[PDB]
Design a protein around this ligand. Structure first.
Ligand SMILES: *[C@@H]1O[C@H](CO)[C@@H](O[C@@H]2O[C@H](CO)[C@@H](O)[C@H](O[C@H]3O[C@H](CO[C@H]4O[C@H](CO)[C@@H](O)[C@H](O)[C@@H]4O)[C@@H](O)[C@H](O)[C@@H]3O)[C@H]2NC(C)=O)[C@H](O)[C@H]1NC(C)=O
Ligand SMILES: *[C@@H]1O[C@H](CO)[C@@H](O[C@@H]2O[C@H](CO)[C@@H](O)[C@H](O[C@H]3O[C@H](CO[C@H]4O[C@H](CO)[C@@H](O)[C@H](O)[C@@H]4O)[C@@H](O)[C@H](O)[C@@H]3O)[C@H]2NC(C)=O)[C@H](O)[C@H]1NC(C)=O
Ligand SMILES: *[C@@H]1O[C@H](CO)[C@@H](O[C@@H]2O[C@H](CO)[C@@H](O)[C@H](O[C@H]3O[C@H](CO)[C@@H](O)[C@H](O)[C@@H]3O)[C@H]2NC(C)=O)[C@H](O)[C@H]1NC(C)=O
Ligand SMILES: *[C@@H]1O[C@H](CO)[C@@H](O[C@@H]2O[C@H](CO)[C@@H](O)[C@H](O[C@H]3O[C@H](CO)[C@@H](O)[C@H](O)[C@@H]3O)[C@H]2NC(C)=O)[C@H](O)[C@H]1NC(C)=O
Ligand SMILES: *[C@@H]1O[C@H](CO)[C@@H](O)[C@H](O)[C@H]1NC(C)=O
Ligand SMILES: *[C@@H]1O[C@H](CO)[C@@H](O)[C@H](O)[C@H]1NC(C)=O
Ligand SMILES: [Cl-]
Ligand SMILES: [Cl-]
Lengths: 425, 425
């Protein structure tokens, strides 16, 4: 028989980590591998019927994603959805598919509200989540001894789909649960220098361990302002939540990075200001299978969709769709082997949750709630060269930190600064 | 043949002006009238299929309204949607119907954003709109000579579906388009006594003609504070946007109201504070057909839904569904007389827009944009008795103001206060 796979992704806009111009060859490679392995759905054929989740302007829309999903459901009767990876498009489509009793795979939709599996039954997330980043910092605080207070700033920009609002919402909500610490939750406009001055005035009263979600330019500007304000590294620690490594040119390899450099005269004084800054990115998989998959993905993305892949850390999202789709196909194969159909949403989904799988991105594990366990990296600056390099790797499954071969965190005083000064704030 | 009307309304919750417990008898009376007249749809049969637009908690929601609409569309293939009335349920369902090319009738959904007929094609609003209130105040200002400045407060309450936010949004937008005056629109928390003191401090600098959208209790508690602060009626005038006449015992009939009285000991001091307050409600139709319709609607509602229908000015929403639907039943008849079909949404809709109809609520007119022309009423205090009464009626179609039974506005100084003082603010 056949197994339709409805796809609701941006088909023309090629500026998203999940856009069809980069996820298309991932699914194509996955389906090419399914058809060469007798152990996966013996004799069946897997098809894709693809709709678009973007409006007339060409951007994510919660208005057109459900329309496309309903059209696809009415016409083709899919067995699964590679639902939207976009926070605003994913919610209505996930509610529709939960009402229809159809599984929904996605390597996007990292928002916290999507993880309420009473309203979003049968949906799986094979890619990074935002709440899983609250486990990482919780593991930092236990290791570094901070157990009192923290502050969390998130920038605002008119264009983006409130990326940092959701990022820090998830981080904050999970950090409250894991730790009984006092956290503060602030926002600033990313273009108003008045807001930056106000923020530099404010912080000395609210915390000594600050997590900032902003663009690389805004974080460099904040560091330069803080250095002038006197906010040195013997007191503060600034953590830049740059998940896709945009300030590190992707952060895809061992090359030395120096994100404090712009060649604008003040980059001599920007190296000084970054002595109290560390960067929290996703983890770049090291296995050779990932490199081979990237090598043969970059070629399909050119021959098929006439689009050139950028060679960064956003490729993990195209690879996670491949891994998740293969995991789903294996679950469906087991379900059929136990005498079922490809329409048993509940039986199929409970064979995906709470198990480990071997993909190109490593040996991953979908947790008991359906969300994938995410691994992170912490970058710090070398005292001698001045270049940034990875110093800590966090394994989501076992929930522990590993120091890279011959590296350790660079603290100005040799040890982390306390999160509570001599006489508080 | 058969004509199927799809209904997406609260079927169990009885606390809405459009809830099925009070709109069901209206539609049943309409369909009884259709079946007794050879003029309308000769020989056809009209029948309704019901879906609920409320979630588990029992409140109308934007999550369960489109789900019910999609289920109804896929199962019964309706010719028209007697769509939702909530501002939040009516948007996704309106977009779905616009995408399907199916007309959507509603006497609710007054929000301004629902009147953009490029995104909401084929939808008709046979009931009051919020922007149509901005036509009223403009026609009021021209009559009283105010042409400089205005201020608009709206209350915020956790429970309501941001009723006053949308009311003031529509009013403010339409007043901005139709006048050159400078308008400023604030917000205040309704159950936070600090905000009231803050507002009484603020107002004397930002306006002298104020429109307040709040609950009757909030308006009275704020008028007492205004009297205490010295904001008397020789300078300020306060307009209470109480559209359904909640503060006037429903605002229907000829009896005299006393909205300043609770027997709490401040009645003597509350009658004095209301000398600078006037109330803007909907207009209660004065024709005998409306009274007969109410008489045979209450009995039917009690007999057929075990719900007792207290009289008031919220009964115009049940009666508009009765009118609009009938208007539609006429339009779809004329189409058939020209060789069309019941599924000619575009030709059916343009035969409803920009024409007048004779219903139980008067001789109504649907404007060229599809929204009905609403008539308003202005209530003012009698200087002698101290009881409130209707003193102005506003005809939406022709946009004139009519004094009622030789009545006149009670201005504490004899003429309207200036909207800009001797030396401004
Ligand atoms: C594909 O989709 C992308 C969206 O990822 C479209 O690109 C535009 O991307 C920007 C930011 O990445 C986004 O702001 C645009 O939408 C918003 O645009 C303005 C803001 O833009 C202005 O300010 C920014 C700084 O914040 C300047 O960099 C920019 O030059 C402007 O001066 C908002 O005010 C709007 O309200 C809107 O929300 C986004 N494009 C659109 C139409 O929203 C890209 O056009 C798409 N391309 C194709 C071919 O479909
Ligand atoms: C029928 O529909 C009405 C809506 O018109 C329902 O009333 C609402 O019901 C929902 C859940 O069913 C409930 O969440 C709403 O409460 C809202 O407000 C509270 C805070 O309100 C507090 O103050 C008011 C003051 O009057 C108290 O009455 C109330 O008990 C609270 O102490 C929020 O915390 C909630 O989150 C929510 O936003 C409620 N609102 C109103 C105005 O009634 C009604 O339950 C439905 N009934 C049935 C049988 O379906
Ligand atoms: C993150 O942690 C996990 C474990 O905490 C690391 O290793 C994996 O651990 C599981 C058990 O928890 C192993 O089963 C898995 O290796 C086995 O996988 C299959 C099936 O068991 C077997 O055929 C293999 O030969 C191997 O025995 C572990 N995966 C490995 C070692 O690759 C995981 O590696 C950590 N993350 C990273 C990036 O290393
Ligand atoms: C508000 O004003 C409108 C008009 O500005 C009144 O409604 C009708 O107006 C039209 C012309 O604009 C009148 O022709 C109509 O009266 C006739 O309507 C039909 C068809 O023309 C005819 O068969 C009737 O016999 C009647 O002669 C007006 N409708 C009436 C007078 O009922 C409207 O009445 C005004 N509002 C109120 C509350 O009166
Ligand atoms: C998940 O699987 C483990 C075995 O690996 C089991 O012990 C645990 O109970 C499972 N959790 C749930 C929620 O089923
Ligand atoms: C609406 O009807 C009037 C006459 O009632 C007509 O003059 C006008 O052209 C019609 N259309 C518009 C857009 O006004
Ligand atoms: Cl998407
Ligand atoms: Cl509704």
């Amino acid at each position: 028989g056949n197994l339709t796979v409805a796809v609701v992704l941006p088909l023309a806009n090629t500026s998203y980590p999940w856009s069809w111009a980069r996820v298309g060859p991932a699914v194509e490679l996955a389906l090419a591998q399914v058809k060469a392995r007798p152990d996966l759905l013996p004799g069946w054929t897997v098809r894709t019927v693809l709709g678009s989740s973007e409006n007339a302007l060409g951007v994510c829309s919660d208005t057109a994603a459900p329309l496309a999903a309903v059209d696809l459901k009415w016409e083709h009767n899919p067995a699964v959805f590679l639902g939207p990876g976009c926070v605003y498009a994913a919610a209505p489509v996930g509610r529709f598919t939960a009402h229809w009793r159809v599984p929904l795979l996605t390597a996007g939709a990292p928002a916290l509200g999507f993880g309420v599996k009473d309203e979003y039954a049968l949906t799986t997330r094979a890619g990074p989540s935002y709440a899983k980043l609250g486990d990482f910092v919780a593991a930092l605080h236990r290791r570094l001894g901070w157990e009192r207070q923290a502050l969390m700033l998130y920038a605002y920009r008119p264009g983006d789909e409130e990326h940092c609002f959701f990022l820090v919402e998830g981080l904050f909500m999970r950090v409250r649960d894991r730790l009984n610490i006092t956290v503060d939750h602030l926002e600033f406009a990313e273009d108003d220098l008045s807001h930056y001055t106000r923020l530099l005035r404010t912080m000395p009263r609210k915390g000594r361990v600050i997590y900032i979600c902003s663009s690389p330019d805004a974080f460099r500007t904040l560091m330069l302002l803080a250095l002038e304000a006197g906010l040195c590294g013997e007191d503060y620690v600034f953590f830049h939540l740059d998940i896709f490594g945009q300030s590190l040119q992707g952060g895809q390899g061992p090359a030395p990075r120096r994100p404090w450099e712009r060649g604008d005269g003040q980059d001599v004084s920007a190296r000084q200001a970054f002595q109290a800054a560390k960067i929290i990115t996703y983890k770049d998989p090291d296995n050779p299978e990932y490199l081979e998959f990237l090598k043969q993905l970059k070629h399909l993305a050119y021959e098929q969709f006439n689009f050139t892949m950028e060679d960064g850390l956003v490729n993990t999202i195209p690879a996670s769709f491949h891994d998740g789709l293969l995991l789903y196909i294996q679950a469906v194969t087991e379900t059929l082997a136990h005498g079922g159909t490809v329409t048993d949403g509940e039986n199929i989904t409970q064979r995906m949750w709470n198990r480990s799988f071997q993909g190109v991105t490593g040996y991953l594990k979908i947790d008991s709630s359906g969300d994938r366990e995410t691994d992170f990296s912490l970058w710090d600056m070398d005292p001698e060269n001045g270049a940034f390099r990875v110093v800590l790797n966090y394994n989501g499954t076992s929930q522990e930190l590993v120091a890279v071969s011959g590296r350790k965190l660079n603290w100005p005083l040799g040890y982390p600064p306390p999160d509570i000064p001599k006489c508080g704030f």
